[PDB]
C-alpha cells in the first residue's frame, strides 16, 4: 500500500518499481536562501502527507469557504499507491544562496554525447522531484500541488510522465518490457543488494562531500525512440542490437532470460555488449526509468521513448563512461537523447522532524 | 487483467466500464482503392480480436523468420487482456471517399462554431478513429501502435491523445473518479446496465434513418484545456458555486450524499450542472466516457492539464450540441478552454469471428 518516506535514505531509488512515474523540474525564483529552507520545510510535510495518501496542509475541503484549500482534491478516495517522493538538486541550484562550494564535485555536467539533440528547454533544472506510485493520478496530484504549494518561489522548468508495469496484472519479478518490446532491467542493481548499494549507488563520507552521504547522483535522460523505423527492421537485426533474443532476453548462446551473458559471443556494437560493466572498467548502475508516450509529431510519427534514469554514486565512475561507450551502439539508429539533466539526490529524511536538503543548508 | 468480450450487438468502449487508461487515434485515410480500405477494416479486426484477448497480432512477436520484422512489435508480451476495449469510428470526412457521399448519417451532424473555442485544427477532426481504452497504458498503446503500423500505406495517425486517468463512470456502484479541478466527474451518467436509458439516448435505431449505423453510436471529442493555476486560485465557495455540487462528497447543494438527485434550483443560473442537466436541454442526455491529460508545460512555468471528453449519444443534434450550446453562459467557462474537437459515427458491433469493422457500411 504504502512505503514510508522517513529512512537514511530517500525513497525512490532503492525501493521497488511503482508502475507510473511524474517527474518534474523546478527552477528556483526566490533568492532569500530562508525563504527556500521555508519551502523544503513545508514541501517535506507535504509529502509526509501525500506518501500517506493523505490530503496536503489541512485537506481538500471542510475550510473556510471563502479560502482556497490547502490541497486540490484530485487524490481524495485514492491510495497512497506505494508514492515515492525524491528531490534532487541540480548544478544550478548552488549558485543561489551563496552554496557555490557545496556543490559535489561528483555532480559532474555530462559532456555532449555524440548524437545529442538536447531540448535546453526540457533539460535541466535546479531542482527535481520523482514521483513514483502505482496510480498515476496520486503521482501527478502530488507533482500538482507541491508545485502549487512553491509558487512564488519556483516554477515547473520540465514535466515527463512515465509509465513500466501495470501491478494488479503484471508478477513483480518479471521484468518489464521497453516499447521497442524487449525486457529491460534483466542485469541492474537492486534494492535488496544492500552492498552492491554502498559500492555502486550511496555517495560515503569519504568521497568527499558529507552533505551527501546517503544521497546518490541521478542522471535522466529523455530519449526518443524512432518507433516505425525499429518495426520495420528485422527480427535478427532487432536481436543483434541488443545481444538477447526477444522472446526469451537470453543472451546469445544461452537459454535463459537471466543466464549470464557471452559478450564475446555479441556483435561488437552490440547495446548489452557496450553497456556492461565488465566493458566499463566495472562501472555499474541502477536503472530506474520508465516508457513515456506523449503523443504523435508532426508528421504522424509516435512521439515515444525511455525516460531514462540512473542512480550512481558518482557521475564521473557511472554513467559518463557506460554512455561514452555507447558511441557506436548498434541501437544509435534507433534513438535520439533530446533531454538530460543531473542532479544531487540528498540523504533521507531521518525523521518526524527533518527536512529535504537539511544537510546541505543545516 | 480479464477481457471484455469484442464481439457483440454494439461495439465495447461505450456501455462497458471504464477502463483506467485511453489511447485514441485519429487516423486519415491515404489510399483511394475502396478495396484495400476494406481489406484494411477486416485486418485491423482480426488483430482487434487478438490484442483484446491478450495475444499477439499476425504471426507473433517472434520466432518468425530472423530477416522478417515481426509481426506484433512485442511490448504487450507477458501482459493481460486488461479490459482492453478497441472502439472505431468514421468521421465525416470518411463520406468524401469510396463513393459513401450518400450513406453520411444525418445524426452525424458537424459542430456549430462555439464561443471561445480555441481549436487547433491539426489535433482536430479526422477521417476515422480508434479508442483504445486498457487499465494498463502499455497494453493500450500496444494496440494504437500495432493497428498503425498494420494501416501503413493506407491510413495515417493524424493525432493521438493519452488519457493518463478516467473522469467518466458507467459503473454508479463503483467510485466516482475525479478529474484534474478535484471534483468527481461521472455521477449523474448513463450505466451499462441501464438498458433501456442506452437505447433511448445512445444507440441508433433503424427507424432514425441510417439503416447501417442501427446498434452504432455517435462520438464528440473535445480537448478541452483548464485554467489550473486560475483555478487553484479559486475559493472552495467559488469552485462549488461553479459545479453545484460539493467538493469533497460531490452532493448536489444542499444534499447530503453525492448521488442524492439534485434541486436545481438551488444551483446558481450558471452553475454547470444546473445549465448541463436533461431537464434544462429538452431531456437531451449523454453517455460521457472521457479522461484526465497531462502536456507538459507552457514553456512558462506552469503545468499545463486538461480533460480529453468523450460523449456518445444517439444523435449530435439532439445530444452533446443543445447541452454545449447551453453551457454558453456557464460558469466553468472562465476555467476551460475547448483546443480541438472531432465527431465521429461508431458503427454497430461485430457480430462474430465471420463480421468485421465497417461491414455495415461497407
Ligand atoms: C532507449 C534507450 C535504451 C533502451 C531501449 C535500452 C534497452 C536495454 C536492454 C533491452 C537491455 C538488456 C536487458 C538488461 O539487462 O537490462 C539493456 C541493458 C543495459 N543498458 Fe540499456 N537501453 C537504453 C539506454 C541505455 C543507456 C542510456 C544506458 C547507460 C548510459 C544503458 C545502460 C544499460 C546497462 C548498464 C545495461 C545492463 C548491461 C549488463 O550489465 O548486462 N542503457 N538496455
Ligand atoms: C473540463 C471540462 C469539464 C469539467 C471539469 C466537467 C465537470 C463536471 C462535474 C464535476 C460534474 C458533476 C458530476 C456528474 O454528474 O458527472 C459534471 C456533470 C455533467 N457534465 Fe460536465 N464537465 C466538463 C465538461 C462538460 C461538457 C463539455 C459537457 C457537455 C457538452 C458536460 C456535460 C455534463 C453533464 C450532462 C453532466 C451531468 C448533469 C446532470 O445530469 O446532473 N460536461 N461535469
Redesign the pocket.
Known amino acids: 500500500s504504502a512505503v514510508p518516506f522517513h529512512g537514511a535514505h530517500q525513497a525512490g531509488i532503492a525501493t521497488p518499481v511503482q508502475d507510473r512515474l511524474h517527474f518534474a523540474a523546478f527552477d528556483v525564483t526566490t533568492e532569500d536562501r530562508a525563504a527556500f529552507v521555508a519551502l523544503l520545510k513545508e514541501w517535506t510535510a507535504a509529502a509526509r502527507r501525500l506518501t500517506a495518501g493523505h490530503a496536503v496542509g489541512e485537506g481538500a475541503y471542510g475550510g473556510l469557504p471563502e479560502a482556497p484549500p490547502d490541497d486540490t482534491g484530485e487524490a481524495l478516495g485514492l491510495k497512497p499507491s506505494r508514492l515515492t517522493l525524491t528531490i534532487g538538486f541540480g548544478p544550478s541550484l548552488f549558485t543561489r544562496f551563496g552554496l557555490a562550494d557545496l556543490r559535489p564535485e561528483a555532480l559532474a555536467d555530462l559532456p555532449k554525447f555524440p548524437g545529442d539533440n538536447l531540448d535546453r528547454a526540457r533539460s535541466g533544472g535546479d531542482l527535481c522531484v520523482q514521483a513514483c506510485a502505482d496510480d498515476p493520478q496520486v503521482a501527478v496530484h502530488a507533482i500538482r500541488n507541491l508545485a502549487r504549494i512553491g509558487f512564488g518561489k519556483v516554477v515547473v522548468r520540465w514535466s515527463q510522465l512515465g509509465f513500466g508495469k501495470t501491478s494488479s496484472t503484471t508478477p513483480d519479478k518479471q ?1 518489464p518490457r ?3 518490446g ?7 542493481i537492486a534494492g535488496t543488494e544492500k552492498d552492491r548499494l554502498d559500492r555502486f549507488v550511496w555517495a560515503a563520507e569519504k568521497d568527499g562531500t558529507p552533505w551527501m552521504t546517503g544521497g546518490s547522483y541521478l ?1 535522466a ?1 529523455r ?1 526518443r ?1 524512432h518507433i516505425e523505423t525499429w518495426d520495420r527492421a528485422s527480427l535478427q537485426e532487432q536481436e543483434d542490437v ?3 533474443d526477444k522472446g526469451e ?1 537470453a543472451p546469445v548462446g544461452k537459454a535463459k532470460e537471466r543466464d549470464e ?1 557471452f559478450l564475446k559471443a555479441m556483435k561488437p556494437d552490440a ?2 555488449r557496450l ?3 565488465d566493458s566499463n572498467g566495472g562501472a ?2 541502477l ?1 530506474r526509468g520508465y516508457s513515456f508516450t506523449d503523443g504523435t509529431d508532426g508528421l504522424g510519427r509516435l512521439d515515444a ?2 525516460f ?1 534514469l ?1 542512480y550512481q554514486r558518482d557521475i564521473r565512475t557511472g ?1 559518463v563512461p ?2 561514452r561507450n ?1 558511441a557506436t551502439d548498434a ?1 544509435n539508429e534507433y ?1 535520439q ?1 533530446v533531454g538530460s539533466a543531473v542532479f544531487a539526490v540528498p540523504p533521507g529524511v531521518r525523521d518526524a522532524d527533518d527536512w529535504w536538503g537539511s544537510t546541505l543548508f543545516g
Open positions: 521484468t521497453n516499447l521497442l524487449f525486457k529491460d532491467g534483466t542485469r541492474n542522471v535522460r530519449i525512440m541488443f545481444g538477447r532476453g551473458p547495446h548489452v553497456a556492461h560493466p555499474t548502475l536503472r521513448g525511455l531514462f540512473a554513467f557506460v554512455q555507447l541501437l534513438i537523447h
